[PDB]
Structures are given as structure tokens and as C-alpha cells.
Amino acid sequence: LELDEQQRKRLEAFLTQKQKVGELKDDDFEKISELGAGNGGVVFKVSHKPSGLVMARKLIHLEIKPAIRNQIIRELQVLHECNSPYIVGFYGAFYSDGEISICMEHMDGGSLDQVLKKAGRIPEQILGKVSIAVIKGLTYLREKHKIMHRDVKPSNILVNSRGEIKLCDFGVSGQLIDSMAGTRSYMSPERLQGTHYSVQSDIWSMGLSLVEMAVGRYPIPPPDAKELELMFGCPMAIFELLDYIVNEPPPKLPSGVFSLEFQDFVNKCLIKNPAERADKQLMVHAFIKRSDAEEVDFAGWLCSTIGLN
Ligand SMILES: O=c1[nH]ccc2cc(O[C@H]3CCNC3)c(Cl)cc12
């Protein structure tokens, strides 16, 4: 988890800005626009009027007694300790007139589910950079805070015009989840069977997210030989889909379109047995080592694709 000079400096400049804000209050915010929704909430792009800082404000509507909300706010304080170039910045949390507010760093490229809608499909070299950021974010959360994400999916991966890729919406408050109490289509087979689940279930979710972004479609059930012929040249109810994840072979990338290293990488993420599934091993996988040495202009690709500007 060692940082380069540029990463260390950006992290230092975020904390210095954060120290100037102080106590977050409802009336100190002006709504600019809506960014997205949401695991039981809506996210707005806001102006924090006293400090002049543009933030992303997540609003969760919850009607509960003062007892429960005071514990939720104290449980969200753990987010002030998460400082990584792969984890979205956190400003603070508060409660006001029936709703919890989570204030965080604004990512101007939005989430990868929105980038995927625009782009159609994301190239392999760009997915290499996304894979590194997700592995490094998951490593940080586990090593420094003994927590796992539990909800890896394209909508929980944020991107910006500086070429940064960061994870958001990892559950840290037990009381907040209980009071509420999202899709289960990215959950590993062992999680859907209520069995033994570790950080291995997040690796499955990553592999699944990568296949979806590479092909430009949620990958279950697999596309037919004619669907792939349309795409590259070369309905299912949620309960049926969850049964398919548990009982059928895992999805895979089509061949002769992606490199064998990218194919091998997603196959190792998507092995149904959590013990056979790769863990440290992903960081030294051929696809990851090749992608780390590649000089990919992610910010450039992103700005051109979504029209950022
Ligand atoms: O700029 C952001 N910073 C922090 C958080 C955040 C969350 C966002 O969308 C939620 C709603 C859908 N999935 C994640 C979106 Cl679209 C943007 C941000």
C-alpha cells in the first residue's frame, strides 16, 4: 500500500481542506444537481457555503428515535480514519429532519455504471487500471481497518477527470443497515447460500463487474453466439438469476476479443469455490503486472468518452 509522490500530496491537500470545514450543518448546504441513486438514498452535488467546497451529499431518509441516529452517526465516524487514493474522501455525517447525510469528495466522472451506459463497453487497458484500483482499495480496507467492502459493483466504483478510481458505499454501521432492513445480482454463490464468506466474496463481485464492463451487458445468463456476433462481429426475474449464480457454471469473457491474460484473470476471480478462487495472488497476476507497466491515459479516455468539457 506504498504511495507515489503525487498520491501522497493529493491526500495531504484533501486533509488540509477537510480540517477547515468544521461541524457539518444542514443549512450550510446549497443543492447544485443530482448525481445518482442509490443504496436506499439519493446523492446530490452540493456547495458547502461557508468553506466554498463542492461535495457529494448522500441523503438516506430514515424516521427513527434520537437514540438510534446518535449511534449511527458515532458508527459513521470510522470513515474519518480511511485515507487512501482508492477510497473516496469523507467529510462527515449528520442527521436533520428525518434524514441521514453522508458528505464526501465529489468525483466528476461519476460511477462506472454511468460511464458504461455512455461508452457502451470499456476497453481492456482501461479495465486493467480499474482492476488495480479495486484490488488496492480492498487491500487497504482489510489491512488498515479489518473491514471488507461487501458491495462491490460498477455503481460503487467512482472515477474523476484527474484519472483517479475510488471505491464508495462500504457498510461500516451495523445500526444503519438494521434500520434499513440493494441488488444481490453481484453477490458470490457462497453469500447467496448463506455460507462462509470473507474478502473472497468481494473478489467474485469484482470479476463479475469486469465482465459486465468488458462486454457492455450484465453477464448472466451468457450471451448467445448471435448476440456476441452483433456486439464484436465474431427475461430473467431476480430470483431465477440468483438460482442461476448458485447452480450454473460462472460467466466468462468471449474468446478471441480479449487477451488470454485478461481472460485468465476474470476466471480466477469467478471460481465458485471460495478456497480455489484467487485471493495477494491477484496483485501479482500477469494481467495486473502488465497493466501496471502500461502507460494508459485514463483521464484522457474518460473525458473524451463522457464529454467532460
Ligand atoms: O461524486 C461522488 N462522491 C461520492 C459518492 C458518490 C456516489 C454516487 O452515486 C451513488 C448512487 C449510485 N451508486 C453510488 C455518485 Cl454518482 C457520485 C458520488
Swiss-Prot record:
UniProt GO cellular component terms: axon; cell cortex; centrosome; ciliary basal body; cytosol; dendrite cytoplasm; early endosome; endoplasmic reticulum
Organism: Homo sapiens (Human)
Phosphoserine sites (modified residues): 179
Residues covered by the Protein kinase domain: 29-288
Gene behind the chain: MAP2K1
Subunit architecture: Found in a complex with at least BRAF, HRAS, MAP2K1, MAPK3/ERK1 and RGS14. Forms a heterodimer with MAP2K2/MEK2. Forms heterodimers with KSR2 which further dimerize to form tetramers. Interacts with KSR1 or KSR2 and BRAF; the interaction with KSR1 or KSR2 mediates KSR1-BRAF or KSR2-BRAF dimerization. Interacts with ARBB2, LAMTOR3 and RAF1. Interacts with MAPK1/ERK2. Interacts with MORG1. Interacts with PPARG. Interacts with isoform 1 of VRK2. Interacts with SGK1. Interacts with BIRC6/bruce. Interacts with KAT7; the interaction promotes KAT7 phosphorylation. (Microbial infection) Interacts with Yersinia YopJ.
Tissue: Widely expressed, with extremely low levels in brain.
Pathology noted in the entry: Cardiofaciocutaneous syndrome 3: A form of cardiofaciocutaneous syndrome, a multiple congenital anomaly disorder characterized by a distinctive facial appearance, heart defects and intellectual disability. Heart defects include pulmonic stenosis, atrial septal defects and hypertrophic cardiomyopathy. Some affected individuals present with ectodermal abnormalities such as sparse, friable hair, hyperkeratotic skin lesions and a generalized ichthyosis-like condition. Typical facial features are similar to Noonan syndrome. Melorheostosis, isolated: A sclerosing bone disorder characterized by hyperostosis of the cortex of tubular bones, frequently involving one limb. The lesions may be accompanied by abnormalities of adjacent soft tissue, joint contractures, sclerodermatous skin lesions, muscle atrophy, or hemangioma.
Lipid bilayer topology: Peripheral membrane protein
Full protein name: Dual specificity mitogen-activated protein kinase kinase 1
A Pfam family: Pkinase
Residues the entry annotates as binding K-252a: 105-107, 155
Effect on the protein upon substituting residue 239 to S: Loss of interaction with BRAF and KSR1. Loss of BRAF-KSR1 dimerization
Binding site for ATP: 35-43, 58, 104-107, 111-114, 153-156, 169
Key words, A-Z: Acetylation, ATP-binding, Cardiomyopathy, Cytoplasm, Cytoskeleton, Disease variant, Ectodermal dysplasia, Intellectual disability, Kinase, Membrane, Nucleotide-binding, Nucleus, Phosphoprotein, Serine/threonine-protein kinase, Transferase, Tyrosine-protein kinase
Residues where U0126 binds: 58, 169-172
Positions of the catalytic residues: 151 (proton acceptor)
Entry's Gene Ontology molecular function annotations: ATP binding; MAP kinase kinase activity; MAP-kinase scaffold activity; mitogen-activated protein kinase kinase kinase binding; protein kinase activator activity; protein kinase activity; protein serine kinase activity; protein serine/threonine kinase activator activity
Effect on the protein upon substituting residue 179 to A: Loss of catalytic activity. No effect on BRAF-KSR1 dimerization
Domain notes: The proline-rich region localized between residues 270 and 307 is important for binding to RAF1 and activation of MAP2K1/MEK1.
